[PDB]
Amino acid sequence: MSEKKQPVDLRAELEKHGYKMETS
Amino acid sequence: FSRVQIEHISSLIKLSKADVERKLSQMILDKKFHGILDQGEGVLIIFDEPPVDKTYEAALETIQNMSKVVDSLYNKAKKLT
Amino acid sequence: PPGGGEQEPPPPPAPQDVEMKEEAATGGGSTGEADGKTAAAAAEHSQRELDTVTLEDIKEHVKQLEKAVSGKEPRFVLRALRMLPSTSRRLNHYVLYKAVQGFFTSNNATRDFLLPFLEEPMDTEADLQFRPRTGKAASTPLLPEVEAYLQLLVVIFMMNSKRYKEAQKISDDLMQKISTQNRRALDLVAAKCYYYHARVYEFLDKLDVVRSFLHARLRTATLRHDADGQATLLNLLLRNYLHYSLYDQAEKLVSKSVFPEQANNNEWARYLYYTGRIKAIQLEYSEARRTMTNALRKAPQHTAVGFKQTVHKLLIVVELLLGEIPDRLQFRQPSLKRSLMPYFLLTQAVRTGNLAKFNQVLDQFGEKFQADGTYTLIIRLRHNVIKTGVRMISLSYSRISLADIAQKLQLDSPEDAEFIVAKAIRDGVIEASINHEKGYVQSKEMIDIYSTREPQLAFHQRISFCLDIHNMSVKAMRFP
Amino acid sequence: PKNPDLRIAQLRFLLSLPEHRGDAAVRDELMAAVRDNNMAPYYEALCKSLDWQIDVDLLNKMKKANEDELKRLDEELEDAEKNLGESEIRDAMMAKAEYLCRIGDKEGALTAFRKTYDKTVALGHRLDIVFYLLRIGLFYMDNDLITRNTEKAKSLIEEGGDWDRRNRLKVYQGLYCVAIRDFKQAAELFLDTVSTFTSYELMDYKTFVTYTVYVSMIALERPDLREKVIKGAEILEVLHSLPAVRQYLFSLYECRYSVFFQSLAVVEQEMKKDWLFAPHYRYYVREMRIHAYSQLLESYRSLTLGYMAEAFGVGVEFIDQELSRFIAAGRLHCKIDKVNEIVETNRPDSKNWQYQETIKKGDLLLNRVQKLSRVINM
Amino acid sequence: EQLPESAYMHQLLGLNLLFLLSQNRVAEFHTELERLPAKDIQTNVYIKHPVSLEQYLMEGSYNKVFLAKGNIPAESYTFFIDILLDTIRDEIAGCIEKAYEKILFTEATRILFFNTPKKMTDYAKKRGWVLGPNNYYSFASQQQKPEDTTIPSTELAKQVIEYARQLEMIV
């Protein structure tokens, strides 16, 4: 300004989704 | 007829209920057939509320009116610096 | 040695010109602007003085020492003199001292000579017409000098400028009469050195003696010169009163008024950041999010530097307490980024419904929480995790058992499972219905309504009251 | 004059992101470094990849002999300008200095581009220049200079008409639209498919086939998807050669969900190892979730999850946590009921969202005018 | 500000703050600790109990609060937590319904706990709501079914009545 205030201071997923099949 | 049972409408089309449910739902996928079926009781119901027109007008105005105030950002922030 | 010795002459001529003609053209021009028109005010050299002061606040200021023409202090501070036709001879005496400074050493060092100098305008007796010219001729050396922070023997000289400003304050309580068209520029200049009151007093401890003195000045400007005076003095109040307890939350209630008109420009926006943290202490999140957003969105153009980034930092704090926040990593600047780096993972932990993710953020970033000053809401946000966590899973899951959801809701016993959703409807979260036996939470939704009435009916008064104000502006700006 | 250095840039992507390749990526980098006599490229590769051992006199005498090949051309320009033949002079120094700039960075490139800009009277050589900015913009992944050369070339090409090189530009702008996120313009501009055949600037044609078939499954409608792949006569064979993507195309239409994440695993594995696809896969995957689940729910308004669990293997309790956690993310929001065995789709959102754009856009709209209103005057 | 340090100088803020927030005041907590953060951060922190207690008020508790009613810092302040309990009990009945859906009986025995207290009769009357056998209902229905039909249409007319008056003010 310079006046006033300022000058003061489930993933993506790849692996897990493919694993859901062979899990159960 | 909007509301109809699936078994006797498959009797009018002379086809099995498996590919009647999947083809009709495929017609809903194409949006040309307005309605939906019901698998639990074997029902098919047609309903529609076509017009979006007012929302099209609204969106067309305001979405561009964003860039309008962006265009006014050039002039009205130029007098500052 | 020859290079550094011959590079001393080049720098001074630039302050010898612009720093000489800045208060000569603006201050001397404001003299003719203060003789007539009077319209009513304007006094466009007051805002031009703001441009010159903000220009000095970066480069080069004046002193310090710099060992370049320290005779600029006695130049404008002496030789009114005295009545206007006699002042014209002194207007030639500034050129006379330009030749005297162009011949001899030109008194490149003042230092302890400020004692007779600063008291020379009181030796003239007097200017006598323009107090802003006397206050500015003394302060313009001293006010940029506060940026040196030498803290030896010149701090009481800044206090002498504060006493000269107190003589400006007594004259701010008297004449008037009538339309002291120069007191708006006195509101401008004094607000500056009232913030220099803040800085110089903050060199040791709080200014509390000047809190009763500020209340003396803020109340004596009531109701006459409060315009543009009360706004800056209220920020002078609110800033350090936000640093030192107490009662300012209820004090600004009875203080308002508003206080209209908002001046100048970003002053009201930063005030809505100051009182924005205030109104955020009451925790009502619609008024807090609107006062925090309107604080940052209303502030052009910067630089400098990081406090305009600080209002954006604390802005979305109330949005974290709302329960829904976007990921702000795309809004990071080259500076604001490195400042908020802990606050990044904080709002990322607010988006997620995980408890350990948010608690680990608290334990690790607690040091940065001490730097910002916002603490108390970090522990209660766990209730925002249980409400957003249940908003998540309920709408998410078809029918969820109270034992399976008990992992993310961390208790979710067969009893409190009723209240989690029920008391969320009290807060307007989720409509999920639960028949409790084992049990299981079956979440459905049917709502078709609203999105209509209040938006369009308010837009009527919004647009109309707006264009009415734009009328009050354009219709009144046609004086030329 | 592209694919040799195009593979070098692909080797930069093979070195950069994955940290688990320490052998093949540096090997074929040196195999491509000993040819084309690159200098500045192997400096950036020297900081990123291994620092050797020793290069020094090897590539310094190669840059010395190439300097002799550089100084034979740069000392022929004053001997060639001794005679006069309009182009019979500067066309040699514009193309070979770009080959001398192919030795490094942007310098000879950009200085020859604006050099020859005032000479060539034909658009073919101007578009060849455009090809040089596009390859040098592809190596450094800089999208700033790839827009300007094409914007100036198309006006001369579309004045106008072309067959081959117009399809070439469609591949370029398709590679730029897929460099950033554009789903529709990539497949729409790649609709030419086999008409581009194979070119040195189009690199491997099979990779281009994978580029258009991977991007045509997102923003393209399901009837339009099968209209592209199945009804397309020329594209069907080149997508049939690779069963990986063809299996994903015909199974997506087959609606079977038991092969999806395995076929998507092969598709995503190809998505990870290809450049410029790294930022865009995170949305691409969850988009394929809501893509395949959009036709899952649309079958029936009220669906019995027992019928869903009939052939899944196994979807009894899996679709509960799977679809739910995808609903919580914001993908395919719906209200489903259990022990009543009702999956209710929904929610059309034909009331709130219909009128929401007014107040939504009007919020920031009237906000942005509130700024400019209350700022001035004072 | 400088005074000899007193033992109760710290907790007089926090224990009064305990009763302050645990009576469900979400504002006065922030402005009570808004003096300066430093004195609150150092040590002797009683702050964790009330805030989590309030999270257990909308949880609600009852259960975890009764377990927190066994462990209190406390200290020496009793009749504050007595009215604190009273303002908790009545505000649970105020924050429950309207509107909540159908639930069973023995979990409404879990609502007010005890075994079969007379407070469950006081609320089942006050709520109203419904008293069902072995169940409870929100009928009927959900509730009162706001339409709103043409009741807003009158003020809709009035809206542009004085707005066209503002249109004539331009004109």
Measure the CA–CA gap between C53 and C51, rounded to whole angstroms. Answer: 6
Q: Are C30 and C46 in contact (CB under 8 A)?
A: yes
Residue with tokens 């906000």: D367
**Which residues in chain C are closer than 8 Å to A1, comparing Cβ atoms?**
54, 266, 301-302
C416 in helix, strand or coil? Answer: coil
Chain C residue closest in CA terms to A2: C54
Burial of B10-27, coded b for 16+ CB within 10 Å and e otherwise, reads beeeeeeeeebbeebbbe
Interior CA angle at D285 toward D281 and D286, to 5°? 125
Mark which residues 382-411 of C lie under 8 Å from E by CB: 382-383, 386-387, 411
Could you tell me how far CA C132 lies from the centroid of its own chain?
24
Please tell me whether the peptide bond between D109 and the residue prior to it is cis, using omega within 30 degrees of 0: no
The residues in A 3-22 lying below 8 A from C, measured between CB atoms, are 3-9
The answer to whether the Cβ–Cβ distance between D377 and C456 falls below 8 Å is no
CB contact under 8 A, C54 and A3: yes
Strands (E), chain D: 302-303, 335-337, 342-344
Question: Subunits with at least 3 CB pairs below 8 A relative to chain D?
Answer: A, B, C
Q: How far is A9 from chain D (nearest CA, A)?
A: 23
- DSSP for C77-100, written as a single string: HS---SSHHHHHHHHHHHHHHHHH
Tell which residue, E52, E49, E46, has the closest CA to residue E12: E46
C-beta atoms of C451 and D359 within 8 A: yes
Tokens of C222: 């009531």
**D73 neighbors D98 (Cβ within 8 angstroms):** no
Q: For CA atoms D238, D241, D247, D248, give the dihedral sign.
A: negative
Sequence-ordered list of residues with C-beta below 8 angstroms from that of C38, at least 6 positions apart, any chain: C179, C181
- With CA atoms as reference, report the closest residue to C378 among C400, C363, C399, C396: C363
Q: Inter-chain contact C379–E160, Cβ cutoff 8 Å? A: no
Q: In the block, which residue shows the tokens 């399901």?
A: D222
**Structural resolution in Å:** 7.0
- Residue C188, both tokens: 């401008």
Instruction: Report d(CA D240, CA D215) in Å as an integer.
Output: 17
- Determine, for residues D264 and A10 on separate chains, whether the beta-carbon distance falls below 8 Å: no
- The answer to whether D375 contacts B65, with C-beta atoms less than 8 Å apart, is no
| CB hemisphere CA count around D200 (13 angstroms) | 9
Closest CA to E32 of D73, C283, D111, D122: C283
Q: Hey, what are D137's tokens?
A: 């913009």
Lookup: tokens for B80: 């500052």
Q: Are D100 and D108 in contact (CB under 8 A)?
A: yes
The verdict on C451 touching B (C-beta cutoff 8 Å) is no
Within 10 angstroms of residue D112's Cβ, the number of other Cβ atoms is 22
Amino acid letter at B34? H
Q: Are C101 and C107 a contacting pair, CB within 8 Å?
A: yes
Residue of C nearest to E41 (CA): C370
Q: Which of C281, C316, C359 is nearest to E48 (CA)?
A: C359
For residue C45, count CB atoms less than 10 angstroms from its CB and return exposed for 0-12, middle for 13-18, buried for 19 or more: buried
Reduced to 3 states (helix: H, G, I; strand: E, B; else coil), residue D337 is: strand
Q: B37: helix, coil or strand?
A: strand
Per-residue burial over E80-115, b = 16 or more CB atoms within 10 Å of its CB, e = otherwise: bbeebeeebeebbbebbbeebbebbbebbebbbeee
Q: In a 3-state reduction of DSSP, which class is residue D275?
A: coil
Taking the CA of residue D187 and the nearest CA in chain C, the distance in Å comes to 28
Q: Which residues of E touch C472 (CB under 8 A)?
A: none
Taking a C-beta distance cutoff of 8 angstroms, is the pair D165, D196 a contact? Answer: no
CA C409, CA C398: separation in Å to the nearest integer?
A: 17
3-class state of residue C441 by DSSP: strand
Q: How does DSSP classify residue C64? A: S
Torsion angle (degrees, nearest 10) of CA E109, E110, E114, E116: 10
How far, CA to CA in Å, does C332 sit from each of C302, C309, D142, D325? 16, 10, 22, 29
Contacts of C399 (CB under 8 A, 6+ apart): C440, C441, C442, C443, D337, D338, D339
Give the C-alpha separation, C321 to C314, whole Å: 12
- Torsion, Cα D279 D281 D284 D286, to 10 degrees, reads -110
Tokens, residue D346 = 């929904």
The amino acid occupying position E127 is: R
- Helix spans in B2-46 (H): 6-13, 17-29
Instruction: Indicate the DSSP class of residue C434.
Output: E
Coil, strand or helix at E142: coil
Query: Experimentally, how was this structure solved?
Result: cryo-EM
Instruction: Return residues 279-318 of C near B (CB < 8 Å).
Output: 300-301
**Dist. CA D193–CA E28, nearest whole Å:** 67
In the DSSP assignment, the letter for residue C18 is I
Closest Cα to residue D323, out of D312, C349, D340?
D312
Half-sphere exposure of C405 (CA within 13 A, CB side): 35
